[model samples]
Target: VSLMEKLKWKIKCIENKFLNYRLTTNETVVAETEYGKVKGVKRLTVYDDSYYSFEGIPYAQPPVGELRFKAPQRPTPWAGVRDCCNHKDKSVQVDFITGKVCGSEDCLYLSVYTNNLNPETKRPVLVYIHGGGFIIGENHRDMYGPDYFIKKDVVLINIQYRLGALGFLSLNSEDLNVPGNAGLKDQVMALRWIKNNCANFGGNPDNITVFGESAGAASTHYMMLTEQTRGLFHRGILMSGNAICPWANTQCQHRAFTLAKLAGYKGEDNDKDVLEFLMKAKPQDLIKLEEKVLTLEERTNKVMFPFGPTVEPYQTADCVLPKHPREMVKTAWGNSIPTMMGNTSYEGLFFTSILKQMPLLVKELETCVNFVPSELADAERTAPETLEMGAKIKKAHVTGETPTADNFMDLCSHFYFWFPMHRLLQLRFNHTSGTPVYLYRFDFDSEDLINPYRIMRSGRGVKGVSHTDELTYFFWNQLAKRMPKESREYKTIERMTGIWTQFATTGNPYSNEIEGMENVSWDPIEKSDEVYKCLNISDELKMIDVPEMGKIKQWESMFEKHRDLF
Candidate 1:
């Protein structure tokens, strides 16, 4: 036989061996897909039922070597019953928790947690994408456990995608061969994979809801905006993020070129040269470039990071984003998906609380005049009207003699998080007459040991809903297991997860019809209503007009009057 025929014979033998199930156990769970058989582990959980967990399942071919900077490709079929119990290495990322660089290039893996492996069950699927400012994140089962959602008869799929320069770099080359938005495409590919294979794992592909926090939430919105992602999922739950946030899209393509130069490239500045240079750089060396950029950004007093999604060049036929984020939301792509968007009360503390040595300004005028522009570029800060605009914002929000931590966090949260989210909501409501959109603000603050922003709490009895506080309730991971059941936090978690699972099952979110929630009704915003209503989640959940709406109104006027300053 020829060498190719010999290789085929060897593969066939391996497949035949596993297809026969040489050794099987009662604990071992197996599900057959179009590609092959996958063996998962069965675990007994607190919910009094066994859930099947299949981890490190590859959804796409490893994007490495020549595949770097290219859209994902279909995964190759494997021979045997693949062992999928252990978590996979995340996409090459800087560990935000440890402040270290650790992961791998071949990281397009996804984990599935299902109550049953019977294809006839047709359970709802929740595909969660993690968020780390598009720079760092991991999607191991430990980070997002299946115990909470599987109890509700939902199959949970946590996925890994490319991040930072490796994910979002756009060289803006002439040929546009190295087009940006490959990471977004990675998500699209994974969704297509799930649509094809989720049923074998007992998930309803037609009922898949893509939900995430921060950058991942932004990713969900980005997927909604793309014409190519129309049939991938039915609904989206955006937590603390929308596509129009200031930091959502990379403002320019200089970051990619700068990274190439740092990698010791002497090639011309054309796309081909840049692509060749990047492909040659080692993955660890590419990570080093980010550290250099971070240092440079700090030295230059820059507000935003160097890498993120960029407007793809119009040359490519399969471009993920057709236009600018703001413009696209105003048009057809904006209203296409049904969504539930929400945020924590003090989202800005995540950034502002890190100011260590720099003494905060003494008064409101001085603080706003200084803080607002620090979040913006130097060009806007230097504008003649910018200072005046800042003064108006300060005068409108501050009531006390000096700026305290409470209002400081609140004001910046509105300016950065709440404002952009409200704008996106109005834009969507105005544009989509048929699609349902609901908004929320998470108010309950659990005593969290794992919260990264916990250092911001002064212990003066002021844990006023810091950023990602809501995540503890919605995503029940390892830390949540240790939480006491009798505590108020535990009750909040039960309610939040119940509502979330209900939303995933149906586009509408409510209180009574959804089990575990108190008797309350959540109504979508009416386009004609002047005051936007919000479903605030506290010990007692209720629908009320936005309390911050009064202040948000002033900021809207300020944003309108001083558009260039922003």
Candidate 2:
């Protein structure tokens, strides 16, 4: 018994091998985690036994080749029992030739579903993190799925991190101990392996919930500023993202520094060290040292993937990343949890219908040239078409009662999604006064898919509200997209999936705010005169500024002109 106590007594008999009953999909179960004995796939063929699904489980340690950008390891427990039943290599699911072949630096990995087990009721967990812009999606892109929260008893988890510049490259490797959000530290080691294995998979590891969509909802605002993801989870849902507002990790670091100067290393001639021995060759000799740094040939990947989730002046003040998480949630820094946020009133019609198919002189010189300092790039070089006619008169002042293609599809859905989601909810209403916030504005749009810059209308005779068009009405994942479904958008996706699974089973999103939404009112978002809620959509469920909708401080003066100066 000295082989390390026989590998800790065969991983403690695969952690109760199947802890007597409550396992579903007709018995083929297995779970034991100090990281071993996985196997699962049988919740009666996708939730008819009402729940239980597991696919490709291995939570960490596969980050491949030098464990890729390092940082996530602790998952080496296999002696030969790692099956997980199905769906492992979808880490990318079709980048076709150059998505670097469906992700695998042994990408930490995760996927789950529940309802078949009941270690005594603890359910309510929702985890999901996919949203292409960390440079493409996954968590096996379950496209709005997880057997619809295991038949709504709730408990779903989907993840997969690390993409582009391979888990966020910041290391040309003079090794400031390389850590450019190692794909957000493999989502803080998958929320610390679901806060240490969501109670042996029945979930409720303290009623967790962490939603995403669009760079996984800007990584749920960088996992609420990770202290190693504090309290693992309690509430969050972001969708159509908005913290430090998009251009996620800055999309790709100027073609990863012109492919590190064609493998000779010369970004301003190595200004301050780090040549990583010119990427230690061979990714097919660095894909021919990335052929002239992925030759722009004539510029366009929406001006090179929106200049990548950039901002890493080689970060470190413990991994810098708040290019303005609005003065670190107005001085609370990570804004002590509790959030539900929303933004799909046509998220700039899905990034301005993919930048109006590029080249209208690069979408009318983008925001008169990426507004910020230098007086909004000298006011978009002074009158550059009066900043393109005040962005088409702010999309004809919010579609003057609709049409002309819903006011040019609400001008790229309010300049790429409601001005970066009301500028990150006015920088989280100037950084909290006691965390408890819930803001939304989804207004479920659809004629069916269109607005492809013709602006709005993709289904029937008009299904506009593009980009993840309100992701099957706030993620019900109903066989995830192909479009055309609306019984009043399936009763507002059964009333916003029961106000988002009762705000992750207790944070209170609403069970009372009923028609005319009369305020028993959900809380959080201390004044700039807050009142968020606008779900509105057809025949009977209207609420924009009604029922429960009025938080109209709309970018409270451009978030108080870059709120509290940060």
Candidate 3:
């Protein structure tokens, strides 16, 4: 065969190999798990006529009462069939979308969806980790409805964990085995449950692929690092965020200290006193206190994420990460798995939208460039050199004309989201030789995917598809609402679902199955070739070298100095 034929032939084999152990039938997704049999309800959506969904399946016992602040423990098994037809309350948080503390401490649950139940024909499994800055999120099916994926031969698992201080409060003790990732710890067990029970749901335990967006993506990266997660998942798909992002991990313990003080806990700074005092507070009290702290942070425009994952001491077996995430990725210790990752063109808009309400602060747009602003510099222990570097960063990405609502959104997008994402991708691709690493830039803008009802910012038009807007394609959503079947948005959805699931199944985003995508080949980030090729998914899907190269170059030099600003 000629080289082109050889390549096509090889690609076909991989696709075929993906389905080698899987094929299906529609059935009620009744599954016998270790805990008990779950009778899932039948769910329908835009694509699939029928798919089974089991919601609120407990993976770990509720971390309430004495269990609070401790690592997740196995859920106690029940005697009879449990009804898992609906989602349980999410983690304790003042939901950002709703502005209410409206969930439960007993929220360590997971939902599963599939159209088949034949253990012999085990299908690929996709476990989704929802993202809300590791503070506000849930395992609900609506946001990421599984119908789009289940119509194919995939089992989708949506899981939730503790949120805010309850999930991320760090005691800074390895002996305690509490490295402030109880949320991740909760997911580790969820994967184990899936491994043991996914077969009953017609899922291939051995072929599990974990994927998520934002904080969820960062959690997936943490799963890749933690020894406990070894063999729990064989593949991963990260979207928009990674563990090394500046917001992903925190080093200081003062947030916990401050929160504890607010709860009226007059205790010593020692581990025992602090842990006892914080854990004793009611979950509601904890959430309320957290709200106050968050309000204070937001009012002051503080850039610190007080509650988040942290570096556990190296001596612990339960260490999700004993070192910095950069070191972990650089060493390729947990990079054995093939991966697919990318970001939206305007990831920062999701955060920068706040500028629309504060037009007066639009003049202070350059002040928003660094993660640690000058006022909070002492607390962040930010170096003087880093502040100078931050000015260079502002000059590189911002301009006199960059102060408008639209312009500020793009500026923050480059400095905060796109640059850090691109650099992290470069790090992973360069570190993991011979491993397939697919990258993309989601710039597709559609009426459905763009600003709708001015929910993002009143009268403000979005430049490109904002962060999480791309999710409209991968999952069924209202973003694609009002768009016709032949609309560019729907077609992009058709194309993206194919690319996402193909990568989930075969570790490659390029699929021969996408109709109208006849000869397109999504290039893997070729570290050896020293060329960064990414699939730019927009109105036109094409491979490009160094996406937004000039901006990327500017950010790259600025990043070398002020990466912490990310």
Candidate 4:
């Protein structure tokens, strides 16, 4: 009976393919969602696999008018089948290249892709949240295509939410009722919509994994710590960012006032006045003021963005982050959920522009206090002990020799990505709740295809996998030229997408279904382990102890001593 069922399923898939081909190339497909019916289109992957795409499905009402800077509201029901073939507008943000404000304020939408819409299929679901330091990025397929994951027979979803001041500006006032994290709330609304409507698109609402890169990864980690996102997802894959990162959370009331003043507000300098003025300000004017709002100290320390998730000053029904993540992660409800997380071998190489400023960096290192982790810096920017700690770090990484780019890169990688990730891992191990947590370090590098950031920023001399390099394997970006099937780059893509989909299917990264990964067996980390074990992903898959143990231990000891400051 099982064999007969498998045969019947294959026949049905083939029949569906032919039926789609018989229709117009822009074939229309419909899925009945909770709010209304949505008409999608048939599309093909790079490997010629047939899949249905439903783009621009609104999950919430346009965050325009009075809705701006407030928690998202459910999208009003539509009368007829809404057209969802084309991608919708992204949230208003400064284009990194053009340096101009683009996108719209009404940008709370999600896109879904799948090979089966039979409801009974119960395929696993993978939802991606893009990252841009909480300021830029979108869910468009030009950078993040569903082709790779869809071929693995899982439902893929990409969601867009509010960005920058429009998304994260918080008055932190109970009277004004703006608690910040509106962007995070937008994500929650999209998740609720997916939970309610995924089954109709051949997804298993019970088996959903939320994954992301950088700020998006930080957003995923934030969701895991918050009560607002409870039971929304069963698994998580955080790539290179977490809530513990120094820049992920901040006190933004001062920045909000600064932005209001920058936008020509003539009202009194108070939270209420600022909120009222910003609500009426034009979106482009608000977006362009992002750089102007950052303090000189913030810019020097690379706390580049002024707006991000924040601890709500007061608790309310809609509070997303009631307390700082350090307090919340102690007994986080999402700890028991399966988790897969890690960073690239050299995450800070992406910050080449900073490293190139040799004289300024060298001068900054003389104090060393500026380079200290933000948590410690926030506690005591110029205290004797803080300066002593900074001196020790500089001695270890920079003092012995002439400061090279590699030395600064190590410092940035540790302070920003590596240490924070390891800190979270230690916390999880200490607070184990029966479920396993898989850890990895992505080290794959291809001469033909490198991360777009590395390609654009780092000259030929800079080597080692940089930040977002892992994304080159998981998604087909138009910016990265496509390689032939027989190339190592394509094989790396297969290995990556296969490992990810396998984890989404069953909460484990190792899978025999993938061609080169059959022999790999990944074991979860344990509290009793002497050394941290992680999968080193490169030309070969090997289980090895995590590198930079000495540096990680130094940061760990500092954090442990100053735990209260956090």
Best by lDDT: 4
Error of 1 at 38 (Å): 1.9
Residues 93-164, candidate 3, lDDT per residue (tens digit)?
874433446788989999888766554576888999987788887765435666567667788888998888
Sort by lDDT, top down from the best: 4, 1, 3, 2
Indicate the residue-level lDDT of 31 in model 4. 89
Of 1 and 4, the candidate ahead on lDDT is 4
Question: Candidate 3 — which pairs collide?
Answer: none
lDDT of 1 by residue, 484-534 (tens): 676677677677878888788888777475434555668877777788777
User: Could you tell me how far off, in angstroms, the CA of residue 367 lies in candidate 2 after the best superposition?
Assistant: 9.6
Top candidate by TM-score: 4
User: For candidate 2, lDDT tens digit of each residue in 262-330?
Assistant: 666644644134335433534333333432444453132223332234444555544545344444455
Give candidates' CA RMSD values in order.
8.9, 20.4, 9.8, 8.1
Residue 560 local lDDT, model 3: 57
lDDT of 4 by residue, 244-317 (tens): 88878888867888999899999788888889999999999999888789887777766768999998888877
Off by over 4 Å in 4: 1-24, 357-359, 378-380, 450-452, 455-461, 563-566
Evaluate residue 518 in candidate 1 and report its C-alpha lDDT on the 0 to 100 scale: 58
From the highest TM-score down, the ranking of the candidates is 4, 1, 3, 2
Give the Å shift of residue 97 in candidate 2. Answer: 41
> In model 1, what is the error at residue 332, expressed in angstroms?
4.0
**10 residues in a row with least lDDT, candidate 1:** 451-460
Model 3: residues with Cα > 4 Å off, grouped in runs = 1-29, 46-48, 173-177, 267-270, 294-304, 313-317, 359-384, 449-463, 477-483, 529-531, 559-566
In order of appearance, the predictions have TM-scores of 0.87, 0.33, 0.85, 0.92
